[PDB]
Amino acid sequence: KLPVPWPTLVTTLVQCFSRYPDHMKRHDFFKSAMPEGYVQERTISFKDDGKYKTRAVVKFEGDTLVNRIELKGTDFKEDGNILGHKLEYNFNSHNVYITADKQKNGIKANFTVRHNVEDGSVQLADHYQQNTPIGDGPVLLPDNHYLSYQTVLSKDPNEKRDHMVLLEFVTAAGIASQGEELFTGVVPILVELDGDVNGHKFSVRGEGEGDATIGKLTLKFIST
């Protein structure tokens, strides 16, 4: 069993698969950084509770888009919504607001996730995010815009291990690269997360595919 609820890991567990409308393609930093990719760093503050710090390398390895993450979580309360596993097994729609970071050659994002709690309350998870390109080539630095997310969480009836099946759709809104041309079809995805929350160590491996033409992610994650 994971030491934390699966919904608290969703945002950490590949924004290059967002479906940017034709008129917004010049604002897609994520695909423009490919194939060498980018580093995504977050601090996630669970209000009235602990925090995650995450660092992810997102790049192509051959034909596979890989998301390799290190997560460190501290200061979570025994009694709280996270360690108490009081979060509902679902995920609300959210808008992720992206701004260019000109000092670095990348972007920042901010958003606050609302996790439904089983007693009817809401657990906030405030996200601060920064992305920096790995490669030396030019990248697309966007005007202000946002990504609109939709998520459904489910379970595989066949799966014995602790796991999460996820289907998501993501489109850009609020308002061109050769890297974009790497996403014209279905792309296999591999996610690897090494985690430590409050001293409890765990790993997650995910496999699936992304289809940026429709903004679709289909992934199954398994914990160890």
DSSP string covering 109-128? EEEEEEEEBTTS-EEEEEEE
HSE-CB of 178 using CA atoms within 13 angstroms: 4
CB atoms closer than 10 angstroms to residue 96: 20
Contact indicator for 54, 69 with CB cutoff of 8 Å = yes
Q: What angle (nearest 5°) sits at the alpha carbon of residue 151, between those of residues 149 and 152?
A: 170
| Distance of alpha carbon 16 from alpha carbon 182, whole angstroms | 10
How far apart are alpha carbons 22 and 180 in whole angstroms?
12
Closest of 43, 58, 7, 23 to residue 143, by C-alpha: 23
Resolution, rounded to a tenth of an Å? 1.6
- CA–CA distance, 212 with 149 (Å, rounded to integer): 13
CB 110 within 8 A of CB 33: no
Rounded Cα distance, 65 and 28, in Å: 16
The strand pair at 187-197 and 145-154 is best described as: unpaired
Pairing verdict, β 187-197 and 64-74: parallel
The rounded distance, in Å, linking the Cα atoms of 207 and 119 is 33
In this structure, which amino acid lies at residue 11? T
Cα angle 116, 86, 216; round to 5: 50
Could you tell me what percentage of the chain is helix, strand and coil, using 3-state DSSP and rounding each to the nearest 5?
10, 50, 40
What was the experiment behind these coordinates? X-ray
Amino acid at 215: G
Residue whose C-alpha is closest to residue 16's, from 55, 56, 70:
56
CA 164 to chain centre: 14
Is 205 buried (19+), middle (13-18) or exposed (0-12) by CB count in 10 A? middle
End-to-end CA distance of the chain: 8
Alpha-carbon distance of 189 to 181, in angstroms, equals 17
Measure the CA–CA gap between 33 and 16, rounded to whole angstroms.
9
Q: After which residues is the chain broken (C to N over 2.5 A)?
A: 13, 175
Instruction: State how far the Cα of 112 lies from the Cα of 88, in Å rounded to an integer.
Output: 17
β-bridge mates for residue 181, sequence order:
none
> Which two structure tokens, joined as six digits, stand for 55?
């660092």
Residues 6+ positions from 7 with CB-CB distance below 8 Å: 87, 88, 89, 90, 91, 115, 153
Residue spans of the domains in the chain: they are 1-224
